[PDB]
Amino acid sequence: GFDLNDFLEQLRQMKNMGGMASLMGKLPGMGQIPDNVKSQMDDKVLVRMEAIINSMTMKERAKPEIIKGSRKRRIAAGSGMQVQDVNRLLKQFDDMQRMMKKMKKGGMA
């Protein structure tokens, strides 16, 4: 019930502030330097991640376990990133599907 198609929309729905004042403050107890590392000027990676997804086909966006080196060396060629860059997105996404399945009401405790 979740995939890249839905995960991508979550990025476009960031039109309104996108968290420039929200997520930026969702960490009162900053770990010396956690903020800037997350936002990253809001373009260092926050934008790249989207571009990498835009260069993906409807099939890849639907099934994340069907992408190989033949597809990784293609997305980076169009987006402009590298091979490891595209891999990071898949990794961070793998930990998302596992989290968006073990909860119900908020998932708090």
């Binding site: 929200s22 997520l23 989290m99 908020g106």
Partner: peptide, 8 residues
């Protein structure tokens, strides 16, 4: 809460 989880 969607931004308090996907970003958490």
């Amino acid at each position: 809460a969607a931004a308090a989880a996907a970003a958490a």
